[PDB]
């Protein structure tokens, strides 16, 4: 399902999705 | 980009996978 994700809620979602792979958080 | 799109618009968890290492 589609997501409305701002601020810290976006990095939680990144953490969940990527897990041990890790991720980059790169705003504009 | 993703940070803006997810917040200003909406995004999918599949779109988020593009940001995994
Ligand atoms: Cu909140």
Residue numbers in the entry:
A (entry chain B): 2 to 29
B (entry chain A): 1 to 21
What's written in the study?
Hexameric insulin binds two metal ions by the coordination of three histidine residues (HisB10) to each of the two metal ions. In its natural form the metal is zinc, but insulin is also known to have affinity towards other transition metals, including Mn, Fe, Co, Ni, Cu and Cd, all in the +2 oxidation state. The coordination sphere for each metal site is thus completed by water molecules, some of which are weakly coordinated and easily exchanged.
Hexameric copper insulin is found to adopt the T6 conformation in all of the crystal structures reported here. The water molecules have been removed from the structures and difference maps have been calculated. In our structures no significant difference in the first water shell around the Cu I site was observed in the four different structures.
